Symmetry: C4
């Protein structure tokens, strides 16, 4: 192997084609499928894999009761072959904990998991399947990270982490790893007021992360990282098309510099966007209130134009179906002259929206860009909750 | 690896020997086995694998209810080690969708899946486990393909696709791929009036596909492809021995040029034939009305002689048992001086013929040619439907 | 790889040490374990594997009902990692049928399966995971073979096959394969009156098979094969210690030349012996009437001395527990200066001896020679039949 | 590969970070998970694996009834990918028996299992997946060994074994293996009065084992081995901090030379310690009476100072939860300039402490040293016993 260099531009995207879907909830109604949440995908030179935080129980198992809870000693980052559903029999345990990120640098995979009590959590950083670095909480309030893949360039893999309140100012850092070893640590700079759950991708030597402001903004923070100089900037997505949930109705003008407040009742959801001038696509839930539906909106110059709106759209999950977290990944090792945007949507089933069952879990759908104008339909979870009752 | 070249002649065949049987329905009565339909097999330099369209649920699972339906967002092309039954734990997800083909070019495998709504479907073409090409529907009516393996020669893999009505003239194209990239597109030419579900094999630089005319003919269309010139011809199987289902009684003379109409109530079923002069074998259901039984008939010069009839026969599935789709494959990488014909029969259980259960699925049997005169027995599915009730 | 040559002598054996046990019935009471019978083991340069004839259903499944029957289209030769129990998820399907043998020649594995109706069975011979030869029944009465491993020398792998009555004279042949291709066919010669289910091993250029005379003798036939000249001889085990089941009480003198009749009610069981002068060990059921218990008896010069008796013994399965078939194998690729005898015992549970359940299956235990004097205990199946009711 | 040489010093340790947790009992409530006990971990150049003694049944299976019993013909040493739970589908059977050890020498893995009746047990020593040596009982009373990993240096792997009473003087030997072959045998020397279940690790050419005196002492025996000279010494852990269970209250002074008696009602439990001057850490159950809770105590110079006490502590399992055996392992192939201490805790569920179920099993948690001061929480089993009733 050799270190991945982000030498290629982002592919042009006109629509989104289906990459994978695991149908985990449908299958797990009668097969041994682990309860999960916070899934993502990440690729390496050999192929792409699915990742998620296991809850340490199967879906039909009695221990699925109570899995709405986010943090327990029974969670772990698991990965598995793309397209299969996650079972106790087919998963690789990457690390133990309740918040994670992972990325392959071209040579080996780095995986990071936070675990422990709220006031004293710690991250363990793995590289090539072995633990190499440990990081104690710096602010004593749920040290946590991206919940989707990091990105590497010339051996350097930046990771965004937060420690502190979910509903007030917190302490976010960008940590630059090489072979899982810390090369540099930066405090968050820029205008983003609060950072959670960054979704990141790279092209032409730049890494861009689109995150979640859980404190104030319905517009999403955008962090731009130079992995060579190991420096960064942050701001908000300029477009009037707001993409967090909950959010108010889209205003006539967005704000690049400051959070746009409003929306009820959810303070936020992990999301993503691909920002490449005219070639810009924003994902968001269809509902402005709740994690239901999912749409992709092509919003030219969303990163700079406060009045930018959609010129095209594709429904990924219809608004009669539950969505959840969404994030970015790219197969940086594809046989293509450009890096092609991909994303996943977490399809959450169970609590709190479906409280007639005792559990919370999800399935996954993932799509990638196409230059063609492809037709579309809804890739919802597909399970009947009544079958679980 | 190196590109497969179709340099060898077809083996002479006097009878058929058992290659594989997965007993999926028997096993799936009490193990975690995926609901499938439209199975096939395809080989590569390392061995042969089974393929099918999953329905995204296990057989005993509650979501098996309703799996008579052909198209949903929960289907995917899966492959698995030949002889095992397909489980959530042992399958490779090749691509996502409800119509497929796959073939290995000697170096890597190309897999193609169509998905989406009837009026706006699209194909995604994968090569070496990564998506490389997308193709939008050209006629807005269920873009679809072979449901068995394609065949490659010097890196070129032709695939037959149809878009348009199932019960009227449609728009069929032959698309010539190399490394999953389109080299050439031809509109269907020749005398075949309608083309569905082509079953293809190759020898001495020729690829021959035997298909399903769902509009008019009980005789099967035959497409002959030159993968070097990337051109083709089409006609109907000449023999009076009619091989689609449903079909009328065999007439005194077949028709090479035009469909022979008649038969009730099914408009067609995927099938196959090996056409090599005197060395010609036609498969068909034993019933002329329904997908029950399966027989192989050696019909010398079936491709040219309108009065050709069987000189030998072998019952593969007796007429007291359900069959289904059938198709061709060859282990082009066998240590033999000739390419030996193989075929599979899909053994459909459940709806609509067995409507006392809520599901539809299948198991697989596969056989290959022998120069010996081997005895035979029925390789029916073997499950007791009462056990599922 | 390179062809195995049988250059080494047989190891001296004073007692037997535990090699593997799969506990398949215990585990299969509540896991997805295939119904099997006629198991064995066979090794290759990488390690050893377990083999058996699947019945194409799990043990707890409803289709286990009726698995006392020996021949169906739902059986297959399966292999799996030594020590695991056989599940739909972990087995390799070697070939399809209801009688088998398999052996590795140092380069690739040859596996053979007979299938079909009683009057028209056929063998398919596989090599390196691909079918290479087919053999039709020569006597029209259940063409069948060893049910344990064959043995190879310089690329030549002899296999003993029988076609004809189980209760009268039949037609047995020795077929000499190389890369699964027939090099020579011999009719059975010698004094053995009937041959079934040969258990074979090799050393110093000789292959010796100890078989089952189902027609007359309670003493076992012994076939000695020269795999270089491709010739053989046959006789009966000389010792007065009779080792088939059923058998009469051991007489004062055995018979090398002719069957010793008597015993009730079973006509025979597959068994084995290692015959190496003073270093000779005979296995047999403890009961003279039924397949219960298993004992190893060191009987010096059993192959020549009609008055030879045991000088030592080791109980493998106590006589309060069911046994079944037994056979020989050797890890010819071990890092040892001699080839060490190994054997397995099939531990049959269910019908006909335990007819309070509807099924018949087995588990496996396997042991190998030790020069030490090791203590012993009973390695019985260990399942409680009441748990299955 | 090349032989591991213990050239590196032990890493400095200030706290313990989470390495792995399998949540086997939680998962096994509704998945096919084997009943086990006596688990451990052991690494090789490729990674680390979990090991345990299977009971030859799944947890939910009816045969789990009675698994409190330690010795049966249905037990085996199994290994599996670190972090997964042990299932019939994912385990490697290392050897057959009811007491074990295993270690990798840098080239291949040696695994040893004892089996048989109490008065006539025997060990079989495997190397590279093949049996190579057998050892008969020397004292006729449950020949047995470490129940955690051995350690290798320049191809030499010492193993501590005991044969004789559990409640009186027994016969312990140190056996020095190379490629599974005995190089030397020593009778136990030193002041340790009784030796069971040694937990061993190596650094700078020394192997140190911390064991269980089941006869007299609540202080643990310490055996120090020179694997080059193949010699050893033994004594007791000097510290007043007593680490066996049961034990009396810690006295004002420990004893290096002799057992400190007292404690009720358990005669002992397998445990461990890392002894490296000021860098010394003792594990023990939190309860002095029973196998509940688990704490790590940094006790500088525990190996020499009879008045040494804890300067820091970390709770691994809180005292409201069951623990069990604990032992040492190190990833000797990590990319680190020092060998980093790791340990596991067996989390026993079921009998005898939870006798409202019929079974006994466990799950695993494993942690490794960190130079950081990391926060901590309890990594208890996490299953609800009520769900099993
Ligand atoms: C075969 O498949 C083809 C590809 O899938 C498909 O091609 C599609 O064709 C349609 C019709 O030509 C195109 O639709 C066009 O979309 C743009 C963008 O619309 C999006 O944004 C607008 C503006 O939203 C903002 O303003 C409104 C208030 O005005 C606010 O509510 C909103 O919050 C924003 O602030 C929005 O109004 C649109 O809303 C539609 O879609 C959403 C889901 O995203 C629905 O929830 C909603 O009910 C409504 O239906 C939308 O979000 C628009 O400006 C044009 O007028 C036109 O509608 C697609 O872009 C195009 N897709 C692609 C990828 O090419 C073919 O239609 C298909 N063929 C057939 C026969 O089905
Ligand atoms: C050991 O195994 C050997 C190999 O399996 C086996 O060898 C077989 O031996 C038999 C007997 O010699 C041979 O049978 C011969 O078959 C030919 C061809 O028959 C097939 O086609 C005819 C004609 O069909 C057309 O015309 C009729 C009206 O006339 C229409 O109905 C039909 O639709 C067509 O238009 C057909 O009549 C035959 O029908 C038989 O078989 C079908 C199943 O395919 C049944 O459904 C039907 O009821 C009937 O039984 C058949 O389709 C025929 O012309 C000869 O007269 C002769 O019957 C096999 O070819 C031969 N097989 C091989 C591969 O060698 C041995 O028999 C076996 N030994 C034992 C003891 O079992
Ligand atoms: C620690 O483990 C050690 C190894 O496991 C173990 O060592 C064993 O020690 C015993 C006692 O010294 C030895 O036993 C000896 O065995 C020989 C051979 O006996 C076998 O054959 C005779 C003869 O059988 C023939 O004749 C009789 C009529 O006379 C017929 O019934 C029969 O069908 C034959 O024609 C037979 O009588 C023996 O029968 C015994 O064993 C069978 C099971 O095989 C039982 O079913 C039966 O009830 C009876 O118990 C036997 O088959 C014998 O001649 C000697 O007299 C002596 O009995 C073992 O050989 C030896 N094993 C090895 C491998 O070294 C230690 O005993 C053990 N220590 C402890 C404390 O347990
Ligand atoms: C973020 O995480 C940090 C790391 O996890 C954590 O750092 C910890 O901080 C605490 C507080 O500063 C430190 O605690 C210190 O521990 C030492 C050692 O205490 C241990 O040993 C003593 C002595 O035991 C002996 O004597 C007593 C009688 O005196 C006997 O009972 C006993 O059997 C022995 O003979 C013992 O008293 C302590 O007991 C405590 O802990 C045990 C569990 O181990 C409990 O069961 C018991 O109830 C009691 O709570 C203990 O065993 C001590 O001398 C100091 O006084 C001080 O208590 C930790 O060492 C330190 N850990 C590390 C690894 O750095 C932070 O606290 C955390 N931050 C927050 C906000 O949570
Ligand atoms: C799913 O998990 C929930 C949460 O643990 C279970 O509900 C809980 O059940 C327990 C046992 O009945 C209740 O405990 C009782 O609490 C009262 C006081 O609140 C106490 O007086 C009793 O002695 C007992 O401890 C508990 O309250 C209850 N919690 C809630 C939120 O309802 C539930 O049973 C689980 N469901 C299934 C199907 O497993
Ligand atoms: C297998 O799937 C079928 C099809 O979904 C299930 O049958 C359906 O069951 C639902 C719920 O009872 C029926 O819904 C009802 O429809 C009527 C109007 O038609 C409406 O008034 C009610 O409010 C309700 O929506 C539905 O009609 C029915 N469909 C059919 C074709 O019968 C069936 O229950 C499933 N079986 C099992 C065992 O899971
Ligand atoms: C296990 O398999 C056996 C053998 O198939 C099953 O027993 C069979 O059950 C069927 C259905 O009740 C019986 O069929 C009946 O036969 C009589 C004439 O003999 C006929 O008049 C009826 O119309 C019907 O066909 C069959 O006799 C019976 N066979 C035997 C040997 O008892 C059994 O039910 C299966 N058990 C389980 C639990 O699945
Ligand atoms: C779990 O395993 C235990 C131990 O094997 C089972 O308990 C045992 O059940 C058997 C059958 O009822 C009892 O056998 C009876 O023993 C008396 C004499 O003690 C005899 O007169 C009867 O003829 C019969 O043999 C046995 O005593 C009993 N043992 C104990 C310790 O209670 C138990 O049934 C199993 N539980 C489950 C749910 O599988
Ligand atoms: Ca927000
Ligand atoms: Ca038709
Ligand atoms: Ca006999
Ligand atoms: Ca003690």
């Amino acid at each position: 192997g050799t270190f991945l260099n982000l030498t290629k531009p982002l592919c042009e995207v006109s629509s989104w084609h289906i990459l994978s879907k695991d149908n985990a909830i449908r299958i797990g109604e009668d097969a041994h499928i682990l309860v999960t949440r916070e899934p993502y995908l990440s690729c390496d030179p050999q192929g792409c894999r699915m990742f998620a935080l296991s809850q340490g129980t199967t879906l039909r198992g009695r221990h699925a009761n109570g899995t709405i809870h986010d943090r327990s000693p029974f969670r772990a980052l698991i990965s598995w072959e793309m397209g299969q559903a996650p079972s106790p029999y087919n998963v690789r345990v990457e690390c133990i904990g309740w918040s994670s990120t992972s990325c392959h640098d071209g040579i080996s995979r780095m995986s990071i998991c936070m675990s422990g009590p709220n006031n004293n959590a710690s991250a363990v950083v793995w590289y090539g399947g072995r633990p190499v670095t440990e990081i104690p909480s710096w602010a004593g309030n749920i040290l946590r990270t991206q919940e989707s893949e990091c990105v590497c360039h010339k051996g350097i893999c930046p990771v965004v982490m937060t420690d502190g309140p979910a509903n007030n100012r917190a302490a976010t850092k960008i940590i630059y790893f090489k072979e899982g070893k810390i090369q540099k640590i930066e405090e968050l700079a820029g205008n983003a007021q609060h950072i959670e759950e960054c979704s990141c991708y790279g092209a032409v030597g730049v890494i861009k992360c689109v995150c979640r402001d859980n404190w104030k903004g319905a517009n999403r923070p955008v962090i731009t990282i130079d992995p060579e100089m190991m420096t960064h900037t942050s701001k908000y997505l300029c477009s009037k098309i707001l993409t967090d949930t909950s959010r108010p109705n889209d205003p006539t003008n967005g704000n690049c510099d400051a959070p746009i407040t409003g929306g009820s009742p959810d303070p936020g959801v992990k999301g993503f966007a691909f920002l490449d001038g005219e070639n810009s696509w924003l994902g968001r839930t269809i509902s402005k209130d709740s994690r239901s539906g999912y749409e992709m909106l092509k919003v030219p110059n969303a990163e700079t134009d406060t009045q930018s709106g959609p010129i095209s759209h594709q429904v990924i999950v219809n608004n009669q179906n539950w969505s959840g977290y969404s994030g970015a990944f790219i197969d940086y090792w594809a046989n293509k002259e450009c890096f092609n945007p991909c994303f996943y949507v977490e399809l959450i089933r169970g609590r709190p929206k479906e409280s007639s069952v005792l559990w919370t879990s999800n399935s996954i759908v993932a799509l990638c860009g196409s230059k063609e104008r492809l037709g579309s339909w809804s890739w919802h979870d597909g399970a009947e909750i009544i079958y679980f009752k």
